[PDB]
Design a protein around this ligand. Structure first.
Ligand code: ANP
Ligand code: ANP
Ligand code: ANP
Ligand code: MG
Ligand code: MG
Lengths: 445, 446, 431
């Protein structure tokens, strides 16, 4: 558009000179296009919009070669210079202000069925690639291109699908879940209301998968934030325009005092976000969370909420014992063809919701037992009677041998609420004080 | 008004051109309307007001299409451009300043009987919809149109009334309370002084009901702020223009050490509000508070006044299994017809105070024992006399067998303050004849 | 004054046009009054003063209709626009600067016997209502007119005096104290060196009385600051230009670690006020403090000063039932007749010190026992030589979950009060 703008500026200056010649030598050779006329020409021959009618909304320009509207001031300034190079910063700002006054108001397309990709928009309803148009209002797009694939790319005899199988210890459910996780991380307007956790005992390829995701998706489109940092002030502000958020390494067994922000982000509920020395507001973040960590973080809520939000991926394979192929994480996942194929395969597959692998359900139960001492006690109870409350207490098996703090006669109510037998009241099996509950009995008669 | 101002343009400019022609070629062919004349034309042909005479207050323009006064400088500058496009930003500011000097002073309409709606203004005294007029001064309105509704809209064979009944587990009192809450949430000038709390274990529709409210009401008319965040600095500033505040998820058992701002916002009491790098001032907030959480948070204030303000709504419906429908939260209640019907029904019904369901009273009592250990001990006392005051303070029967914190014999007055039952105050000298002090004496024979 | 300034501007513009005509057509014809001439005209006709000679102090203008000097630059710029509509913000600032250079300096009228009221100034010594004049320098006034009242105004069969009696649970001392509190709150230049605290639990009407006070007085004339908010940054800037400060709900039993600013504000003690990124300065605040809360918060200092500064008002009536009438706090206290009668009754009442009710003295003693464990011990202990036995760790902290001392500061108990000596006599049920 540089040539077109230079050309239009040339005839505009020529017309101004002709009018000055007709009117006589009085305007001392006017050679600079007035900012209002410059804005008129730009609006006529380019696509400028305004995202919102709110105060100090920055004007957006449609980059034809990129297909996404940009609010970057310097790009617009360069465009002005293309039309009129003699305007300084103040006159270009005046042109921008005039354009802001002229252009119409259009909201960004937040349709979950449309995903911006480098080649163009992708429609999930038709599962088809559509060329970039100014009608589709996007501010960012997936870095990697989208072309039809027929064979699995291989570099130096290394296959991406074989690596995916190797990551999951050759489990169809886990590789399917990983592909679904990639596909969900691609979508920014839809969240699926699940939290993805990667657990790793060592060199399990977790970081390699994180870098693969950060490469297939735009590196700018991804945010970095851990679970324990969600409640911290100004941390949520990084989730503004990011397609997904990745926690690189959550500390092992970290304690989250409050996860209200984390749960709200996971379920897509609106949340209060503030910037540094900026007014507070509320926004809805549909970006998915993907946290890679060793072990498993411990939550404070201890309720069914965090149980329903979370999803765990085993990542059992250990590549530390096998020879480490640094080229996989440094070269192979950065190859254009591999990212292309990954993007194509992930975008084509369709699923309404995450399908939990059988390994994840066992891992979810393990997390439930470890986080909640009461549930772990109930699972490992193996007791036969039911009436004696203090026998049921039994000091809870030395805090389930995991020294997790447990209350008296209050967590008993929590246990009975959590869990056929219900409660029984007998005067011959209770109030005997056989044990003054340290405790070594397991089962009585 | 764009057409009207454009017609006003090229006419005043024509007038200046003719005057310059008559006076001779001396003014270099003036073509820009002077900012003062621009302000005169705008004041004559539009409605600009000033909310108050305070320092550097912002001019307000009546949007004829929207029907609400706005202080957004961008819209005003766009209108000025509609009149005189060639004005710079500084010239637009000059026009705004001249208008500020010229226009009159009128206060915002804050009568509780008038509710701004997308379609018009609803009058509760006459229960009627009236067209937008510049006389009514509103800065925001409900984003749902008000239309006459006779048949409940069904989308994909799904009924909103049936969903409301399901959320309440088919309880008439609870559905009535939910409708009353919907009605109260959209009134920005009347508070009823009740703190609505949604309690549920999981997948109970708490979040669905909250974003349903955020849909029927304007999204920008809702402020997201939790109970524990009321007293943090700069947080109250979000309540400036919002008709309701919604706490998406209050952490379970969070200790609210200070409740002054929250209690003030619940009632019609004024509060000190401060913006970021802006002078502090005093404002009254009538927005209703609605908080959804998994269990009632612990409040430091054990006094009766904190308890009376709180209201608790049971969400006892379970949708954890295959019964869950994503379309309900994501699609169905974003439908325009459903929102219109909900707005109509909520606006129509009239009441003076919340009708407390029986289940709410039970849960309010339960939270009363949970928050106040002495009240919990009294409820679980069953010790019938009470002359030996020392056995009564047996760590209040070891926290009535639970856990907590106790004061050392300074809570004696608290027991009488909580209740007197029927024995009132009873202490006799002969007391010392009972053996001192552990769980053997849970009976009245003493 | 709009008509006068419009006429003055028109005649000045005509005179300038005549001068341009007689001097010949030189350049563009003058049509805008120069800022210096505009300032000259404004100074000649209007009334502009300067409160002090400090750095960049703001010019004050006397509003003839309002009767009070204002420093609001918006009003001054509107007046300038009345005189000269063609001046933008910079030219109005130039006019204001010229006026600041010209006008004389007069201090604010801070006479405790003069109270600015919407009808006019009120002379307490004369007990009269004097009309507004520019001679009296005031920056704010009570938003309720002062009219002579003879018969109590009743709205919907509801009496303000009967409601006041109901709030006090039918106690003459308490209603007298409440009227005295209203009178003290209205006066902004006299402090009486007492802190008013509304102590009551559950529904009592403390907030209703506070709203009545904020209604009879100007709403903008009331500051909002709880006792615990006094000592942090930028909070005192709210107190500037306010006749009284009201704390809506102090947290129950809040720990007031720092009370220096609160004590300074309670008395006439000067204090350093700071604005947000504005030149901080020293100032004296005479506004009275009124706080409402459930129970009496305890102070760290627990000394004589906080005891003598504090005053406690009983709110024992409960309306937590069908007795509650919302219209009392929503509509009844907003009635203009009721507010006018309340203002008349309060301002005509005269006194020099607060009349302490007997119940207030009892609660003051109770708070002294609660905040200071030593005095609670002294009250509870109802011989002389034995100090160790009477100590006994405050006889086991007098059963209040307190913390004791090392038996060295315990003898400060004879400060509150063991007449002095045996040589052989110097948990436990036990004096
Ligand atoms: N097939 C393979 N795929 C990926 N990495 C491999 C493979 N075989 C060996 N490796 C090596 O295994 C290591 C995996 O690195 P990385 O995935 O960052 O580890 P991690 O411990 O999971 N990282 P992190 O998530 O931050 O804790 C690197 O040294 C790789 O070179
Ligand atoms: N009557 C209903 N039938 C089926 N699904 C429903 C019904 N009501 C709500 N849902 C769905 O239940 C899901 C969860 O509702 P939501 O209110 O977000 O949960 P929540 O109660 O906030 N969960 P939690 O924070 O963990 O306690 C949403 O997808 C709703 O669409
Ligand atoms: N004499 C009265 N008779 C009946 N109702 C009254 C009376 N005085 C006040 N009320 C009402 O009682 C309520 C008092 O609320 P308010 O004064 O804000 O709180 P409070 O009673 O001081 N404390 P709290 O109950 O914790 O909010 C309002 O509804 C008043 O209209
Ligand atoms: Mg929820
Ligand atoms: Mg109150």
């Amino acid at each position: 558009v540089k040539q077109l703008l230079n050309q239009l500026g040339h005839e505009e200056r020529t017309k101004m000179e002709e009018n000055w010649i007709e009117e006589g030598k009085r305007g001392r050779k006017p050679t600079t296009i007035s900012p209002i006329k410059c804005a008129y020409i730009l609006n006529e021959h380019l696509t400028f919009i305004l995202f919102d009618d709110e105060e100090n909304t920055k004007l957006a320009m449609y980059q034809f070669d990129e297909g996404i509207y940009t609010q970057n001031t310097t790009i617009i300034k360069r465009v002005i210079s293309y039309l009129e190079p003699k305007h300084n910063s103040n006159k270009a700002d005046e042109v921008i202000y005039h354009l802001t006054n002229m252009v119409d108001i259009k909201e960004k397309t937040n349709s979950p069925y449309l995903i911006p990709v480098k080649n163009g928009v992708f429609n999930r309803k038709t599962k088809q690639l559509e060329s970039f148009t100014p009608d589709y209002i996007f501010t960012s797009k997936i870095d990697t291109s989208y072309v039809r694939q027929d064979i699995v790319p291989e570099i130096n005899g290394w296959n991406i699908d074989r690596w995916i199988e190797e990551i999951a210890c050759n489990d169809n459910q886990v590789v399917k879940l990983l592909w679904q996780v990639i596909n969900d991380s691609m979508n920014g307007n839809y969240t699926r209301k699940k939290a993805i956790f990667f657990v790793g005992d060592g060199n399990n390829g977790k970081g390699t998968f994180q870098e693969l995701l950060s490469n297939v998706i735009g590196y700018s489109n991804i945010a970095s934030l851990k679970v324990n940092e969600f409640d911290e002030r100004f941390k949520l502000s990084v989730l503004e325009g990011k397609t997904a958020v990745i926690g690189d390494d959550v500390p092992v067994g970290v304690y989250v005092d409050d996860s209200s922000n984390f749960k709200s982000v996971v379920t897509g509920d609106p949340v209060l976000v503030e910037f540094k020395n900026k007014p507070l507001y509320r926004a809805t973040f549909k970006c998915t969370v993907i946290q890679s960590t060793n072990g498993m973080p411990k939550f404070k809520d201890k309720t069914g909420g965090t149980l329903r939000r979370l999803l765990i991926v085993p990542f059992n394979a250990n590549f530390n014992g096998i020879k480490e192929n640094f080229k996989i994480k440094e070269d192979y996942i950065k190859n254009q063809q591999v990212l292309e194929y990954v993007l194509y395969k992930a975008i084509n597959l369709d699923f309404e919701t995450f399908d939990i692998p059988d390994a994840s359900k066992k891992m979810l139960e393990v997390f439930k037992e470890d986080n909640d001492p009461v549930y772990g006690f109930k699972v490992n109870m193996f007791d036969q009677r039911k009436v004696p409350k203090y026998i049921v207490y039994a000091f809870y098996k030395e805090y389930c041998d995991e020294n997790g703090y447990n209350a008296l006669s209050s967590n008993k109510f929590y246990k009975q609420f959590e869990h056929e037998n219900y409660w029984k009241t007998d005067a011959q099996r209770r109030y005997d004080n056989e044990e003054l509950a340290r405790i070594y009995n397991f089962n009585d008669n």
